Each structure stands twice: as structure tokens, then as C-alpha cells.
Amino acid sequence: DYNGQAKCMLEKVGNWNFDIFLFDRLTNGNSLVSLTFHLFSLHGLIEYFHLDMMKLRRFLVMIQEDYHSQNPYHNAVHAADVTQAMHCYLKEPKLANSVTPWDILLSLIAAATHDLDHPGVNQPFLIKTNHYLATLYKNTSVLENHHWRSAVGLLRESGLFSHLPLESRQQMETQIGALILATDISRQNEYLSLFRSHLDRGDLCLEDTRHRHLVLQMALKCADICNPCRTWELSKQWSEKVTEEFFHQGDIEKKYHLGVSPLCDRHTESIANIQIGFMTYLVEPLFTEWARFSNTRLSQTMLGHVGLNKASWKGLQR
Ligand SMILES: C#Cc1csc2c(=O)n(CC)c(NC3CCCC3)nc12
Ligand SMILES: [Mg+2]
Ligand SMILES: [Zn+2]
DSSP states (O other): OHHHHHHHHHTTTTOTTOOHHHHHHHTTTOHHHHHHHHHHHHTTHHHHTTOOHHHHHHHHHHHHHTSOTTSSSSSHHHHHHHHHHHHHHHTSHHHHTTOOHHHHHHHHHHHHHTTTTOOSSOHHHHHHTTOHHHHHTTTSSHHHHHHHHHHHHHHHHHOTTTTSOHHHHHHHHHHHHHHHHTTOGGGHHHHHHHHHHHHHHTOOOTTSHHHHHHHHHHHHHHHHTOGGGSOHHHHHHHHHHHHHHHHHHHHHHHHTTSOOOTTOOTTTOOHHHHHHHHIIIIIHHHHHHHHHHSOSHHHHHHHHHHHHHHHHHHHTOO
16 A cells, blocks of 8 residues: 555646655655655656666665754755655746756756755854854855755765766756755845846846756745645644744753844744744745746745735734
């Protein structure tokens, strides 16, 4: 049954209401490997790039296993969710009609690896505790640079692309980095303003790689914060997990006199209030610009869920 139903759910991997939680329970925690493998084969990538399936499984397992499963939110199930969303966005017509197999490959790798080896605490925390990552990356997109360099390390170690030219391997590394770095939420204003100006001007040319990669970066940013655009029953699980992780960082800050970060204080802060502010100020602006770019049923469905989920959180107030 368990392998039966898993295989079965993957028939609906293009669906916005895909249930990654059930999927991960069904696979005893193998959701990122098993979904991503399926997508490589669905998008034809194993053939297009002459991939060794043994090396691909090894690669995917190294990724999945380098997530910290004890993180309430930043674990391989979140990676798998982001990868599944990225897949839905790659199916939108303006992307499906311009992306090459190389773009699809880099998008799905970047989605799978984008929070790799995440410690479960944020950049301000690592900076104020003098963590070696904050030094190494000079206080700038500390976590994203760490996920990216960790991804590069796994790419090199797996040999998966060893039969491609060195210059293609290097280019793969660099374009994945630009995708992962776009997920630094502290810089969403720079990405969103540039994207919005391109949409005002109407100047995007998707047959140009640079414009297409700007859009893929915005797609990955959507994938990363699309939790509130899911159905209530998914979004509520994501909200409890993210809050659980923030609040744990809060307890450490409190216990050790570090200063409690915004959003991490379980005594003065609420799950509903945290979601509401986030939806108003980060989610709705990004998804409104996304819907201008890709003005489709999926974009409407996603914005409908934000409005409904936001009303549910208000409802659970007074
Ligand atoms: C600031 C803030 C947030 C308040 S609620 C909330 C949330 O539910 N998520 C999950 C979508 C993220 N994702 C962020 C974490 C860092 C990158 C994306 N950020 C926040
Ligand atoms: Mg991240
Ligand atoms: Zn993420």
C-alpha cells in the first residue's frame, strides 16, 4: 500500500493542493529525494543530460540528509515543498514556453538545496553570537551563501555532472547561487522593486537568459513563501511549524540574554498576528507582482488562499 499510494500521489505532483506532509509520511521521510527524482524524470532531464541514475539518487540523498530534520520548519520537507511549488510555476505558460532543460535542471536543484544545512536560527542571531558563518560571509545573506556553498560542495562531491565541461559546471554553480541568494527575504525590496519596474515597462524578453533568470529568481522567491497561498489545511501546519522554530530561537535569546528577536517572543507574540503581518507586507506584494507577470488561474487561486487564510487568522482573534 505505502509504495502504492506514494507512486500514486506523484501523478498529481502538478497540483497546487498536493499534500507534501502525507507524501513524506508515506515515504518514511524520503519526500525530497523521491519527489525530486520524479521531477528529473518527468521533465526529461535524465535523458537530456545523460545522467547516471545511481549518481542522481546519491546526490539527492546527500542533499536531503544535510537538512536538519529536528528543525520544526527549515528541514527537507520544506525543501520538497518549495521544489514542488517551483514545479507548478515552471508549468505556467510564459515559463513553460521559454525555459530550456538547463533552466529546469538549475531551478529544481536550487529549490531542493536552497535552505541546505539551515541551523534553525536567522541571520541576526548568527551575527550577534559571532557565528563563524557570519564572519565567513561578512554579515551579508549569511544563510543563503551557506546553503549555496554547501550545494556547490554536494554537486562537486556527487560527480553527477562530471561528464559536462568544467565551464558548464562553474556556470551551473553561479546560476544556482543567484537563484538561492534571491531567497534572502531581508532583501525582497530590491528584488521586488526591480521586478515591478520591469513589469511597469513591459520590457521582459523571456528568450533572453538574463530576463528569464530574473523571473526564475522571482518564481523561487514565490515558492519559498507560498505557504499562505496553499489551502488552509496546509498553510495552518506551515504556520505552526514556522512559529514553533521562531519561538525556539526566542527561548534561547531569552535564556542567554541575547535580546529577543522580532517575531520570536512567545510571551508577547501570537501565531495569528505573525501570519497576518507577513501576509500583508511580504506575501501579498510579491504574489500581486507575480500575478501581473503570470496572469493565470494559478495566480488567482494563490491570491484567493492568502485572503481566505488571512480571514481565518483574524477569525481566531476576538
Ligand atoms: C519575517 C517573517 C515571517 C513571519 S511569518 C513567516 C512565514 O510563515 N514564513 C514561511 C513562509 C516565512 N518564510 C521566510 C523565512 C526566511 C525566508 C522566507 N517568514 C515569515
Ligand atoms: Mg532560506
Ligand atoms: Zn526556504
